[PDB]
Design an enzyme around this catalytic site. Structure first.
Site, mmCIF file in Angstrom:
data_model
loop_
_atom_site.group_PDB
_atom_site.id
_atom_site.type_symbol
_atom_site.label_atom_id
_atom_site.label_comp_id
_atom_site.label_asym_id
_atom_site.label_seq_id
_atom_site.Cartn_x
_atom_site.Cartn_y
_atom_site.Cartn_z
ATOM 1 N N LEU A 43 0.799 -1.217 0.000
ATOM 2 C CA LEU A 43 0.000 0.000 0.000
ATOM 3 C C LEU A 43 0.834 1.272 0.000
ATOM 4 O O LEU A 43 0.418 2.276 -0.595
ATOM 5 C CB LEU A 43 -0.925 0.009 1.218
ATOM 6 C CG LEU A 43 -1.875 -1.191 1.245
ATOM 7 C CD1 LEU A 43 -2.643 -1.174 2.567
ATOM 8 C CD2 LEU A 43 -2.828 -1.158 0.058
ATOM 9 N N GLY A 44 1.996 1.262 0.639
ATOM 10 C CA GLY A 44 2.824 2.450 0.659
ATOM 11 C C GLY A 44 3.995 2.297 1.604
ATOM 12 O O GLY A 44 4.139 1.292 2.307
ATOM 13 N N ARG A 45 4.833 3.329 1.601
ATOM 14 C CA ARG A 45 6.017 3.420 2.440
ATOM 15 C C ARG A 45 5.840 4.538 3.455
ATOM 16 O O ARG A 45 5.080 5.485 3.234
ATOM 17 C CB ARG A 45 7.274 3.690 1.604
ATOM 18 C CG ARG A 45 7.830 2.486 0.867
ATOM 19 C CD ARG A 45 8.757 2.938 -0.250
ATOM 20 N NE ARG A 45 9.768 1.939 -0.587
ATOM 21 C CZ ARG A 45 10.602 2.045 -1.617
ATOM 22 N NH1 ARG A 45 10.539 3.101 -2.417
ATOM 23 N NH2 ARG A 45 11.495 1.096 -1.851
ATOM 24 N N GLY A 46 6.546 4.414 4.582
ATOM 25 C CA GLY A 46 6.449 5.383 5.648
ATOM 26 C C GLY A 46 7.812 5.899 6.071
ATOM 27 O O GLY A 46 8.857 5.404 5.637
ATOM 28 N N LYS A 47 7.776 6.926 6.927
ATOM 29 C CA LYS A 47 9.002 7.427 7.535
ATOM 30 C C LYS A 47 9.726 6.327 8.297
ATOM 31 O O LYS A 47 10.960 6.330 8.372
ATOM 32 C CB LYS A 47 8.696 8.599 8.472
ATOM 33 C CG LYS A 47 7.900 9.735 7.844
ATOM 34 C CD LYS A 47 7.721 10.884 8.832
ATOM 35 C CE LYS A 47 7.016 12.075 8.196
ATOM 36 N NZ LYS A 47 6.839 13.200 9.162
ATOM 37 N N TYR A 48 8.979 5.374 8.862
ATOM 38 C CA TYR A 48 9.585 4.286 9.615
ATOM 39 C C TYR A 48 8.907 2.946 9.334
ATOM 40 O O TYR A 48 8.950 2.048 10.180
ATOM 41 C CB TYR A 48 9.525 4.548 11.124
ATOM 42 C CG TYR A 48 9.745 5.982 11.564
ATOM 43 C CD1 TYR A 48 11.012 6.553 11.555
ATOM 44 C CD2 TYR A 48 8.683 6.757 12.016
ATOM 45 C CE1 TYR A 48 11.213 7.859 11.969
ATOM 46 C CE2 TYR A 48 8.874 8.062 12.430
ATOM 47 C CZ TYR A 48 10.139 8.609 12.404
ATOM 48 O OH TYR A 48 10.328 9.908 12.816
ATOM 49 N N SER A 49 8.272 2.778 8.171
ATOM 50 C CA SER A 49 7.476 1.570 7.986
ATOM 51 C C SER A 49 7.183 1.309 6.514
ATOM 52 O O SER A 49 7.334 2.184 5.658
ATOM 53 C CB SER A 49 6.161 1.649 8.773
ATOM 54 O OG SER A 49 5.326 2.688 8.293
ATOM 55 N N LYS A 66 1.593 -3.271 9.003
ATOM 56 C CA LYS A 66 2.579 -2.204 9.017
ATOM 57 C C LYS A 66 3.872 -2.786 9.574
ATOM 58 O O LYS A 66 3.946 -3.109 10.761
ATOM 59 C CB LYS A 66 2.066 -1.041 9.865
ATOM 60 C CG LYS A 66 3.011 0.121 10.058
ATOM 61 C CD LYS A 66 2.388 1.096 11.080
ATOM 62 C CE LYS A 66 3.324 2.230 11.439
ATOM 63 N NZ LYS A 66 2.611 3.292 12.223
ATOM 64 N N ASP A 154 1.346 13.825 16.045
ATOM 65 C CA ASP A 154 1.686 13.845 14.627
ATOM 66 C C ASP A 154 0.415 14.008 13.802
ATOM 67 O O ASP A 154 0.236 13.356 12.771
ATOM 68 C CB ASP A 154 2.450 12.581 14.214
ATOM 69 C CG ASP A 154 3.255 12.766 12.936
ATOM 70 O OD1 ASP A 154 3.423 13.914 12.481
ATOM 71 O OD2 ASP A 154 3.717 11.745 12.382
HETATM 72 C C1 FXB Z 1 -3.689 3.320 0.752
HETATM 73 C C2 FXB Z 1 -3.333 3.664 1.974
HETATM 74 C C3 FXB Z 1 -3.554 2.727 3.161
HETATM 75 O O1 FXB Z 1 -2.557 2.997 4.111
HETATM 76 C C4 FXB Z 1 -2.824 2.594 5.422
HETATM 77 C C5 FXB Z 1 -3.973 1.842 5.693
HETATM 78 C C6 FXB Z 1 -4.249 1.425 7.008
HETATM 79 C C7 FXB Z 1 -3.378 1.771 8.042
HETATM 80 C C8 FXB Z 1 -2.233 2.523 7.775
HETATM 81 C C9 FXB Z 1 -1.942 2.944 6.464
HETATM 82 C C10 FXB Z 1 -0.696 3.710 6.477
HETATM 83 C C11 FXB Z 1 -0.196 3.765 7.784
HETATM 84 C C12 FXB Z 1 1.009 4.509 7.747
HETATM 85 C C13 FXB Z 1 1.202 4.882 6.395
HETATM 86 N N1 FXB Z 1 0.180 4.390 5.664
HETATM 87 C C14 FXB Z 1 0.015 4.567 4.226
HETATM 88 C C15 FXB Z 1 -0.083 6.048 3.851
HETATM 89 C C16 FXB Z 1 1.070 3.815 3.421
HETATM 90 C C17 FXB Z 1 2.478 5.741 5.995
HETATM 91 C C18 FXB Z 1 3.580 5.721 7.078
HETATM 92 C C19 FXB Z 1 3.086 5.851 8.497
HETATM 93 C C20 FXB Z 1 1.982 4.925 8.821
HETATM 94 O O2 FXB Z 1 1.823 4.523 9.924
HETATM 95 C C21 FXB Z 1 -1.132 3.021 8.677
HETATM 96 O O3 FXB Z 1 -1.030 2.843 9.849
#
Ligand code: FXB
Ligand code: CL
Ligand code: CL
Ligand code: CL
Ligand code: CL
Ligand code: CL
Ligand code: NA
Length: 333
Positions: A43-49, A66, A154
């Site tokens: 689904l995506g990338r995070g600052k720490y995840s 995550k 945050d």
């Molecule tokens: C299509 C998007 C779904 O994205 C979800 C869905 C459920 C829960 C979370 C996310 C999520 C989290 C976190 C992040 N996304 C995303 C932006 C990639 C980005 C980094 C920080 C973070 O915690 C969720 O906890």
């Protein structure tokens, strides 16, 4: 030194709870079995995840996983305890499980709900009604987590998820969240630049839940003025300069003096003097339909320099900005 400060709401909620509630360093994590979850897609990338859709093969339900980048053990335990404490609250992400990779031992959080759209992809094209509706839902989450003794720290559009088909909202990313304890000094490096409250920018450590109310105000201003971000600082000092060019320096210096905060004198030379601006300076033909007298009154009461003067989440929920939207009739489509 600086004058102390206490939250004016929910000040002692953690004190009245047992130590086990908030002493996350003492918590022993009961890890699950990673083999219960099979990742389906990224689904995506995070600052720490890294974030994935997955399937729980024990009940054939879809979940979100995550996977956390390496963090100090204290901070993972903090995030897990907070998510466990908040589980079931309104509009807060629901932790279903926690697992570690068998080989790498990397922790992964399992959340219940899929069908997510990041709020930042939606919040610049909302109707006036939808801005009020989703603001109220964010307030329910913040009133709840503050009432449970937790600061999110945050709040920003990227940390709100929307189930668009079901008009459901969730506050996500609890990795910077902390327990509020009166008299504790907190880290000033939290929140993302555009949403940092003045207390962070002047390094005032004895802050509280009201930090989240500043960040929420920055989100509101972004939505009703269609300006992303609303305060567009280029470094930490410029963040405060941009705020002062809107709110004025008079009340900023009043704030600095009240808590006996020491600013670097040469930065103070750059801050200088700025008058408070009319909100109509930010009204244009394309955003005028989002801006009402009650919206500006509400925004004014969130974006206060003095953290003690900002509305609480409950006070915000009582504001006339939400008078009609609480009557929502739950149409899905
Ligand atoms: C299509 C998007 C779904 O994205 C979800 C869905 C459920 C829960 C979370 C996310 C999520 C989290 C976190 C992040 N996304 C995303 C932006 C990639 C980005 C980094 C920080 C973070 O915690 C969720 O906890
Ligand atoms: Cl954001
Ligand atoms: Cl301390
Ligand atoms: Cl901290
Ligand atoms: Cl700006
Ligand atoms: Cl509050
Ligand atoms: Na699910």
């Amino acid at each position: 030194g600086p004058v102390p400060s206490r939250a004016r709401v929910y000040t002692d909620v953690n004190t009245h709870r047992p130590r086990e509630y908030w002493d996350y360093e003492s918590h022993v994590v009961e890890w699950g079995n990673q083999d219960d979850y099979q990742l389906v897609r990224k689904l995506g990338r995070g600052k720490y995840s890294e974030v994935f859709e997955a399937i729980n093969i024990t009940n054939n339900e879809k979940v979100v996983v995550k996977i956390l980048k390496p963090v100090k053990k204290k901070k993972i335990k903090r995030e897990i305890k907070i998510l466990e404490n908040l589980r079931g609250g309104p509009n807060i992400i629901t932790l279903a499980d926690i697992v570690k990779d068998p080989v790498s031992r990397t922790p992964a959080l399992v959340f219940e709900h899929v069908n997510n759209t990041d709020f930042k992809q939606l919040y610049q094209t909302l109707t006036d009604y939808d801005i009020r509706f989703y603001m109220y839902e964010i307030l329910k989450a913040l009133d709840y987590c503050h009432s449970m003794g937790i600061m999110h720290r945050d709040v920003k559009p990227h940390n709100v998820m929307i189930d668009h088909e079901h008009r459901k909202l969730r506050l996500i990313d609890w990795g910077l969240a902390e327990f509020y304890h009166p008299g504790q000094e907190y880290n000033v490096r939290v929140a993302s630049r555009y949403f940092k409250g003045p207390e962070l920018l002047v390094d005032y450590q004895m802050y509280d839940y009201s930090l989240d109310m500043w960040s929420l105000g920055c989100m509101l201003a972004s939505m009703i003025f269609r300006k992303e971000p609303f305060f567009h600082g280029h470094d930490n000092y410029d963040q405060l300069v941009r705020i002062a060019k809107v709110l004025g320096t008079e009340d900023l210096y009043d704030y600095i003096d009240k808590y006996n905060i020491e600013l670097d004198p040469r930065f103070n030379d750059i801050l200088g003097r700025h008058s408070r601006k009319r909100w109509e300076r930010f009204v244009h033909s394309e955003n005028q339909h989002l801006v009402s007298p009650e919206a500006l009154d509400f925004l004014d009461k969130l974006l206060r320099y003095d953290h003690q003067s900002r509305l609480t989440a409950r006070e915000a929920m009582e504001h006339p900005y939400f008078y009609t939207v609480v009557k929502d009739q739950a149409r899905m489509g």
